[PDB]
Each structure stands twice: as C-alpha cells, then as structure tokens.
C-alpha cells in the first residue's frame, strides 16, 4: 500500500496473508473455513496466516492453517484478468474472536464515490520498493466506470472496478494482490491489477465481488 497508514494491530481482522515460505498475496476471511483472494494468486502449497500484524514476528494472535482447497473461478482469464477470484478452503476452521473475524459479502454492488478500506503488506513506495512489517491501510473511493474505462481503454470488464486516486500517490501495489476492498462493512473488491502503482491517471483495478456472491455461496455449499 502506497500513501496509506499503519492500520493498528488486528484492526482489519478479516485480512489474511497467503504464505508459501514468504508472503505473496493477501486475502479475506469470509467464514471460519473460507478465504476469498485473487485467481492470479493461485498456487499449490498455500498456508493461510490469520490474525497477523507484524508478518515477520510471532506476536500472539496468529493462526496458521494450510489450504485444503484452492478454487479458481472456472472463467478466470489470465490474459485479461476477467473473473480474478479464488476461494480457499482451510484444512481446519479458524477460531473466530475480535482479532480474527469474517467479513460480510455484499448484498448489492457499491456506488461510485463510496469510501472503502484497502489493506495489505505490499510495497509502500511508488518508485522502487520497501516492504512493511505491519499491515497498512488506505481509504479510497470507488471511481465511476466511465473514469475507469477512460483510464484503461478496452481493458475494464463488467467484473472490474476502479478505486483510488487519479492524482497519484495512493494505491495498492506489489504484495497487496488478493487482499480486500471493504466498503461499508462489505467485501466489495479484491486487489487485482493496475498500470504501475500510485501513478497519475492510473487508479487501481479490483475484482467486483458483488457479481460473485451466488457463485461463492454455491461453491462453498458444494465443497
């Protein structure tokens, strides 16, 4: 996260880190046994790390649980990033409390201008790289679909939205992929792609979670 702030320990209790011997993506806990992340984050050997703040120090609220199932949307296109969503089933249920908690799925899509919270352990620099120890946060608005399309001609599908800034300096970046965009207490977005990070006129692009609620519920029910 570029241009953001230190969240504070366990203030984003649905935020998870996906770990394969290193942090490589974020995700969002949606019930005690399931996480939502980006399809582009798929790999074998995922360990889900819940209750993290400092991802480099064991502090006491961590739960480390192996993925049992990692389910990429059947229509994910890796060239366009359409349908950039994956469901991860945990091998055992997480213990839910104030510091490890699920986030609600949307009952409707969010409107342009709605302020959202974007979080992750990604890069905090727009030029070069620096990776934080602790979780970072950014408040960012949903942009109009026309502004999104003007920014990214020919590239924005009905399953994507833009959030953030056009003036530069505030965005999700390397290591934030798969993580949450939460608006009014609902998971509306997944960190998906952009042209660089925090560049002028190039806002972040996010998977539009409200389109997938029925798919998520059916997938969980059947697995």
């Amino acid at each position: 996260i570029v241009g953001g702030y230190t969240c504070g320990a366990n203030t984003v209790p649905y935020q998870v880190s996906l770990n394969s011997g290193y942090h490589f993506c974020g995700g969002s806990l949606i019930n005690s046994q399931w996480v939502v992340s980006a399809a582009h984050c798929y790999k074998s050997g995922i360990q889900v790390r819940l209750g993290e703040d400092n991802i480099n120090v064991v502090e006491g609220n961590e739960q480390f649980i192996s993925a049992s199932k990692s389910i990429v949307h059947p229509s994910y296109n890796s060239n366009t990033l359409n349908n950039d969503i994956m469901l991860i089933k945990l091998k055992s249920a997480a213990s839910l409390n104030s510091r490890v908690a699920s986030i609600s799925l949307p009952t409707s899509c969010a409107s342009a201008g709605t302020q959202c919270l974007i979080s992750g352990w990604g890069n905090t620099k727009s030029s070069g790289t620096s990776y934080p120890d602790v979780l970072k946060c950014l408040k960012a608005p949903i942009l109009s679909d026309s502004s999104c399309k003007s920014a990214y001609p020919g590239q924005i599908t009905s399953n994507m939205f833009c959030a953030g800034y056009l003036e530069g300096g505030k965005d999700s970046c390397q290591g934030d992929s798969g993580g949450p965009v939460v608006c009014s207490g609902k998971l509306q977005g997944i960190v998906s792609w952009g042209s660089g990070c925090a560049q002028k006129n190039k806002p972040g692009v996010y998977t539009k979670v409200c389109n997938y609620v029925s798919w998520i519920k059916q997938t969980i029910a059947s697995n």
Partner: peptide, 12 residues
C-alpha cells in the same frame, strides 16, 4: 506496465 501486485508481479 500493466501488472498485478503479486510477489512476483504478473505483468503484460
């Protein structure tokens, strides 16, 4: 470039 914020990035 057009890239994902994964480690490593996926760019296009």
């Amino acid at each position: 470039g057009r890239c994902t914020g994964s480690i490593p990035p996926i760019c296009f």
